[PDB]
Design a protein around this ligand. Structure first.
Ligand code: SF4
Ligand code: SF4
Ligand code: FES
Ligand code: FES
Ligand SMILES: [Fe+3]
Ligand SMILES: [Fe+3]
Ligand SMILES: [Fe+3]
Ligand SMILES: [Fe+3]
Ligand SMILES: [Fe+3]
Ligand SMILES: [Fe+3]
Ligand SMILES: [Fe+3]
Ligand SMILES: [Fe+3]
Ligand SMILES: [Fe+3]
Ligand SMILES: [Fe+3]
Lengths: 633, 633
């Protein structure tokens, strides 16, 4: 089972699933092998009913699609649609939060409110919205209107791009025509240009993809901005992760998906139902996280994270998961059938994401508290039904220090230099105590033993004094393996990094270092890493493609991960991806994405499936940036 | 070659291509066989980097995707993305025309103007825009603003749906949640809901598809509305079709693509360059049409149609095609490589649709006349370079009577009943001289001998007194086979239909009947058929699902054709498709689309690849509607 997952709790549940005959994601993967090589390389097209068209990577015919589409075109069109799909997900999440904010301040949903007034005013100021003499509710209405306006064409470009990157970066992108005109506008233009008989030039297609990836970035940044207004900006928090956070004697409720608009409410209501939970024989309601909705409630409230990504079904295999409350994205639909064998109540809540066989509760912000109580009552009913049933919760968990929003990081550094908080970080980059910054992002993927690339790469970088930040299921992988426990700093960190983590920690009262890796939140909260890197760029007077900052989607899966990787490249970062995207069928497309894009945006993809080699390549990319700044490395 | 195309001119060019060694679409199809059965049935997913996933139609594993996605989910997600892509194309075309109109009336592009003031005011009235006391330019600005506003969420739903269907139909659709909230909003929500780990219920997915198909309808109707304001509403016109419309002694310039914003200008400028063409040794500039941009200029100006769809490369094989001027959609990218062997100058004009190896001219409405002259000068240069080269233009052409906009049809019928123009049509439906109405729409497809299904089905329906209307490449197929020549009415039409076509023709001065089939325009102008059918519905006080009206996408190919077929179903029509969409891998999805959707919208798909059988099925659908109205059949 260590060939399926490096997580010992997951391995234990894989053994239980095997003896109980419950099929898992790894079993379904095995049943899919050998997978189609045309699809894996990108050399398949189904964009019209003359297809499917395939092209042999090598050899004889077919060499070209029926309409004449070349391998270059086919691969670039497929990739562009994946970017658009990812942008559609992140920006659908942001759009939902925009409507939620508008409702809150129009007095239509009093379960929601402006919790972070400081963040509201700073976002308003960034967008050019006047705050002097205005009611907070009016400023917020303007912010939510601006958010909605970035989805369509208007007299300005997408402000959640142009106001969040350095002017010099905006200028470079504008010169190449890459600034998005509107988020849903770009998604639709991708779907148009990639349909049959339209764009058929790889460079032109890929430029469109880069622009659509910035629409994804805008959705991510908008989502983080709106969620912080509504739910609070994260600050350091201490919690736990892995399946041992489930408690046999409690009602275990997982929040799973991406958008916390309902699961933030679940967290609140669950505490006010502690006595109703007790009347049913439980100690309490134990809300736990899965995937990014879990990250959201971890970062804001310290809710423990049960599991992530590819291993999500394992939480149900314990027998102790009374409810799984779903919104959208990255939810394996197998959960609805597994639930019949495990006793879990799987509940969908969003109209555009239902799963056959799950119970649907139509969540409305207007009714959030009532809907939450209905859902938790189902979970309580379920707890009662498992009276007397043995459960097998692996007694395995890690300590997690998290909550490192960009504001939190700036505040932590400000204890070393109150009026120039970024300077202590920069000083330690210059002197080499911090070699550079690496962001780990993205999913797990069944093709890769779970977490093996995140942990292997992170260990090498941390020994070389790289400041490692993480989001999403990359943060999930690292937290489940102890990378967010400060007790592991001596083992994992080089001496320079340890010194910096210790100096900042001790200056923040902790009598101990910051954790080895800083958890910056959910996938949309990759936008927080952008905010940090852009602030560093501003403070140094250079663009992001001169900073010693890299990204790694070390185990990517979702179309959203492709979008994030592409915008990381577009904003100027060397960007590692540790699974193969469907590009190898076209050398010209591969060469653009891994090399000639450098001449457009300064960033580039590093495709490398061997994680030791990827770490070396990421270090070389960091060290090249250091050399370009005239720094030792 | 009659196994490739039923068009004799195409067959002649296929022989020339074969002896010259020029590969065609049919050759590329042959090289693709056998095609992938997983893709053909819909049982392939590439929505995440754990794929590709395939499901065996029958037999053993794989039975489910890696994430747990069932065959039902996989098939419904694929279909929904095709609908979204089609909506993206039709509504990208409409959006372009909206911006063109706005520019025209803001004084930014004086090559464009309000040509149809009556249509402008009627559209304004339909949308609720005041016209009394307003400058036309201000009414138009309001109409273009409204057009742009339908792309995004706002306080009203998409007006180019809710104001163009009967209230009773709007009510049925609203009750099922099917009215789109915004065109690009729906496209993005489809891309989101279909991404990994989101919507996983076939009925829910398909309802989303139906709603997105109405966003496609809105784009089509918007496109026709805006093009009529700018370029004029079609009225009856007489021209010719097929390759014999090329002239060896002239500069032959094909306009090809969909959006006529530039090719309407090409038509104008070409006439003012007749003397510059003569100085170069030509008789003149002979503008000819391909595909739907060709239909647009045929309907408005009588420009002859050279060819359509699958046979587009054959126009180049003649050796006499000096330029091919491209916008977007349905352009085989092979044209750019064929042009090196045929001497044709292939010119792209739109930023989001380039083809490697073609010459790009950046068209701007602000510069339309200048850009057109640059392009035509290239075509003239090309004509000169073929001084002395033999050409082989098949001496094959048909006479085409076209220009039957809905306004034109109403006007024609008004000569039989001035103040109740629809009543003569209804009277003849009731008495059986007109059995019903069939709309032929969509593309040719290399899988089907070109035009064989359109002509086979149309012949059977016309003998059974069906009034046949046609758009797009369905109109192209029928025009190239003589179905738009009134001289063929005696051979093709039943006695009842002949009597009606003759009565209307003779009442319009023609001393002869209307043609056997009425050409209602381009693919967006499927919206004109909706306008006609909705007006009939209004006049009878029933909804469209009670009218004896059917649709047939008899040879479909493009994602746009899937969108049109789906909205034809959604508005209440029995809708034949004569190629297999990728649905047969899921019986539940097939059953929804061909049967249980009847209980939602009253329409349904009829999937039938044998064209004689399809005609019988379409007649049975018409006759069932007649029976439901208590009429003989
Ligand atoms: S778009 Fe071209 S390559 Fe794709 S399926 Fe259609 S014919 Fe084949
Ligand atoms: S979304 Fe599911 S079915 Fe599709 S490729 Fe990914 S794992 Fe396979
Ligand atoms: S041929 Fe396998 S992915 Fe299309
Ligand atoms: S396996 Fe052939 S279309 Fe994917
Ligand atoms: Fe995910
Ligand atoms: Fe993610
Ligand atoms: Fe992910
Ligand atoms: Fe993630
Ligand atoms: Fe994830
Ligand atoms: Fe077409
Ligand atoms: Fe069409
Ligand atoms: Fe078509
Ligand atoms: Fe067509
Ligand atoms: Fe066509």
């Amino acid at each position: 089972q260590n060939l399926k997952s490096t997580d010992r709790a997951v391995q234990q549940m894989l053994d239980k699933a095997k003896r109980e005959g419950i099929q898992t994601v790894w079993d379904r993967y095995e049943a899919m092998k050998p997978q189609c090589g045309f699809g894996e390389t990108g050399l398949c097209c189904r964009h019209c009913l003359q297809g499917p068209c395939r092209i042999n990577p090598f050899g004889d015919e077919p060499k070209v699609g029926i309409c004449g589409a070349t391998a270059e075109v086919i691969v670039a069109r497929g990739l562009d649609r994946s970017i658009a799909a990812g942008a559609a997900g992140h920006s659908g999440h942001a759009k939902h939060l925009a409507h939620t904010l508008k409702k809150a301040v129009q007095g239509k949903a009093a379960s929601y409110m402006i919790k972070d007034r400081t963040k509201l005013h700073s976002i308003a100021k960034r967008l050019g919205i006047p705050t002097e003499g205005q009611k907070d509710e009016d400023i917020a209405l303007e912010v939510a209107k601006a958010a909605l306006a970035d989805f369509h064409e208007k007299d300005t470009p997408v402000l959640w791009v142009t106001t969040v990157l350095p002017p010099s970066r905006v200028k470079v992108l504008s010169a190449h025509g890459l600034i998005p005109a509107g988020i849903d506008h770009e998604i639709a233009e991708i779907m148009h240009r990639t349909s049959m008989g339209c764009d058929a030039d790889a460079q032109n297609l890929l430029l469109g993809g880069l622009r659509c990836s910035l629409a994804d970035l805008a959705g991510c940044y908008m989502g983080t901005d709106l969620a912080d207004i509504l739910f609070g900006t994260p600050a350091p928090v201490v919690t736990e992760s892995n399946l041992g956070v489930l408690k046999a004697d409690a009602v275990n409720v997982a929040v799973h998906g991406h958008n916390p608009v309902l699961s933030d409410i679940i967290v609140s209501v669950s505490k006010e139902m502690e006595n109703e939970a007790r009347a049913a024989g439980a100690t309490g309601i134990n809300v736990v996280g899965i995937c990014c909705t879990g990250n959201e409630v971890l970062m804001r409230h310290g809710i423990p994270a049960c599991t992530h990504s590819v291993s999500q079904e394992m939480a149900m295999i314990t027998g102790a998961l009374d409810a799984m409350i779903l919104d959208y994205q990255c939810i394996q639909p197998s959960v609805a059938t597994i639930a019949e064998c495990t006793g879990t109540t799987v509940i969908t809540t969003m109209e555009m994401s239902k799963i056959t066989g799950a119970t649907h509760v139509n969540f409305a912000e207007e009714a959030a508290v009532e809907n939450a109580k209905q859902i938790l009552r189902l979970a309580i009913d379920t707890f009662k039904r498992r009276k007397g049933k043995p459960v097998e919760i692996p007694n395995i968990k890690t300590k997690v220090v998290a909550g490192f929003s960009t504001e939190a990081i700036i505040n932590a550094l400000s204890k070393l230099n109150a009026n120039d908080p970024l300077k202590p970080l920069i000083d330690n980059v210059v002197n080499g105590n911090i070699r550079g910054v690496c962001l780990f992002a993205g999913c797990n993927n069944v093709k890769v033993p779970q977490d093996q690339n995140f942990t292997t790469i992170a260990r090498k970088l941390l020994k070389q004094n790289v400041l490692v930040v993480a989001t999403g299921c990359g943060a999930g992988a690292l937290m489940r393996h102890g990378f967010m426990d400060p007790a592991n700093v001596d083992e994992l960190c080089g001496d320079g990094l340890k010194a910096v983590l210790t100096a900042i920690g001790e200056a923040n009262g902790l009598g101990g270092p910051l954790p080895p890796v800083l958890h910056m939140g959910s996938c949309v909260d990759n936008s927080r890493a952008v905010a940090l890197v852009a602030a560093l760029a501003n403070r140094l007077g250079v663009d992001l493609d001169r900073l010693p900052v890299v990204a790694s989607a070390a185990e990517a899966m979702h179309e959203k991960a492709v979008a994030i990787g592409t915008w990381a490249v577009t904003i100027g970062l060397p960007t590692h991806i540790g699974v193969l995207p469907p590009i190898t069928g076209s050398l010209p497309v591969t060469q653009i994405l891994t090399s000639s894009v450098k001449d457009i945006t300064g960033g580039y993809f590093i495709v490398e499936l061997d994680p030791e080699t990827a770490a070396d390549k990421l270090l070389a990319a960091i060290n090249e940036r250091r050399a370009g700044l005239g720094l030792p490395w």
